[PDB]
């Protein structure tokens, strides 16, 4: 994800699924290489104490002036026409300057944004369309016309560009937490399981205090936890042995 030679374009942003693996968010977050590392429903310090249901990394390049648009609820041509985060986004936005990775003395032009769209796009959608955009009241047909535009525009990343007009690589990590059977975790080692005694338990990052008993409840395969009428957990499925 973070060291791949070439990123996807912000108009056609890539998405990788992260599953069946141990994350170490300390190795990421304690790095000096990141200019932005902002989380939206968790603190980056706590990512090591959690297990995650599904995780996706979204990878793309933008201009340093535009990294401000990747926060949820923002607006402007990036947040309106090619990459929107949802208002209730949970995850982390991670970004760094690419002026030795994505930038060329003759101009690098491999990266494009979307300048025009009949509507603003919905959260986590992507538009691949190369349709000509009718900015005027007239329709048009064929490849070009007056007030008809190609909808994409290329960034001109040159190392002579000032900071803000330089490229920035962005990764967005876009997980969900403590609600469903988990598949990606921090590096925490399990203990043995003990029953009929009062203990400080932690199941997939669900920390609590109580006594554990073998339940006669019949969970379905998609259920990791059971809740009380007070919306507190009152049963769990052990992630080591599925009782």
């Amino acid at each position: 994800v973070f060291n791949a030679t070439r990123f996807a374009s912000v108009y056609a942003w890539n998405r990788k699924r992260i599953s069946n693996c141990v994350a170490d968010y300390s190795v990421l977050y304690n790095s000096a290489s990141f200019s932005t590392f902002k989380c939206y429903g968790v603190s980056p310090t706590k990512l090591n104490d959690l297990c995650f249901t599904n995780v996706y990394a979204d990878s793309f390049v933008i201009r340093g002036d535009e990294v401000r648009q990747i926060a949820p609820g923002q607006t402007g041509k990036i947040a309106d026409y090619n990459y929107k985060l949802p208002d209730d986004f949970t995850g982390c936005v991670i970004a760094w300057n690419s002026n030795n990775l994505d930038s060329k003395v003759g101009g690098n032009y491999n990266y494009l944004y979307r300048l025009f769209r009949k509507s603003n796009l919905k959260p986590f959608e992507r538009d691949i369309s190369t349709e000509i955009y009718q900015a005027g009241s007239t329709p048009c047909n064929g490849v070009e016309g007056f007030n008809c535009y190609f909808p994409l525009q290329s960034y001109g990343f040159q190392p002579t560009n000032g900071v803000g007009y330089q490229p920035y690589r962005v990764v967005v990590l876009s997980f969900e937490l403590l609600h469903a059977p988990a598949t990606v975790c921090g590096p925490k080692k399990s203990t043995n399981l003990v029953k009929n005694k009062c203990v400080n338990f932690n199941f997939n990052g669900l920390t609590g205090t109580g006594v554990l008993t073998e339940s006669n409840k019949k969970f379905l395969p998609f259920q990791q936890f059971g809740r009380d009428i007070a919306d507190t957990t009152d049963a769990v499925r052990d992630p080591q042995t599925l009782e």
């Epitope: 030679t5 990775l101 003395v105």
Partner: antibody, heavy 124, light 107 residues
Framework: QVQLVQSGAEVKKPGASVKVSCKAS????????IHWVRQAPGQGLEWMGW????????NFAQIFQGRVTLTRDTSISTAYMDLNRLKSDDTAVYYC?????????????????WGAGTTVTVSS | DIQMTQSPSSLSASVGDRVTITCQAS??????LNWYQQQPGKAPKLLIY???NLETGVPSRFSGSGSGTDFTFTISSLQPEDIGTYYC????????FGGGTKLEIKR
């Protein structure tokens, strides 16, 4: 572990055509470009062109434009060169090589893994 | 087009000696240049990328330097496994190759 496997050696008449394949394995085929490159007997290296397996788009070294065609099937993770109207001097060792998965630039070609290669021999 | 020419066509070098090879461009490449080793009977292998970054697992003896139109590659102490032809290739406009430098053991 990753591998590129070429077909066995090819022998052809002048003016004929040859199709050579690289079967990829051990990595995701659409991640990076495949180049084709050759070497004449006891001589230096000579680039043909590249293909982007995610898109099928391809770019050539000038001299080979309108002579070589590059193609690929994504299900079978195989990149091909099909070369038209073979000159006697197209007698060479041929290779394909991958476009650097990590630590490069966005542009830069490199050649980060190469297959064992194959010989094309041209004679009347 | 951009030409790449290597000044030494071949070199005779003893075990433990320092070896230097030069790649000369026709045009200012900044640092858009890579270096390869080809051993007899095998495909080439990438040694230095970006004119001065060493690739993973490569022996520390291999080195590269310079910027602009002109570049060096270096072996700080040659040993018998290093024997083969060394090539530059650029990337400012198409991957054009240089002519290559052969290495032989001095005797």
């Amino acid at each position: 572990q990753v591998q590129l496997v070429q077909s066995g050696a090819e022998v052809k008449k002048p003016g004929a055509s040859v199709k050579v394949s690289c079967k990829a394995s051990g990595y995701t085929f659409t991640g990076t470009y495949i180049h084709w490159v050759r070497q004449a007997p006891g001589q230096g290296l000579e680039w043909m062109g590249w293909i982007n397996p995610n898109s099928g788009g391809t770019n050539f070294a000038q001299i080979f434009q309108g002579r070589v065609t590059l193609t690929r099937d994504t299900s079978i993770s195989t990149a091909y060169m099909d070369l038209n109207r073979l000159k006697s001097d197209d007698t060479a060792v041929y290779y394909c090589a991958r476009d650097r998965v990590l630590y490069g630039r966005s542009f830069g070609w490199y050649f980060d893994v190469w297959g064992a290669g194959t010989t094309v021999t041209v004679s009347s | 087009d951009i030409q790449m020419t290597q000044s030494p066509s071949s070199l005779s070098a003893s075990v433990g000696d320092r070896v230097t090879i030069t790649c000369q461009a026709s045009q200012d490449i900044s640092d858009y240049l890579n270096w390869y080793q080809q051993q007899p009977g095998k495909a080439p292998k990438l040694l230095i990328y970006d004119a001065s970054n060493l690739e993973t697992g490569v022996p520390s003896r291999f080195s590269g330097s310079g910027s602009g139109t002109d570049f060096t590659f270096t072996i700080s102490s040659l040993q018998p496994e290093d024997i083969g032809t060394y090539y530059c290739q650029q990337y400012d406009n198409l991957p054009t190759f240089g002519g290559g430098t052969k290495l032989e053991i001095k005797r």
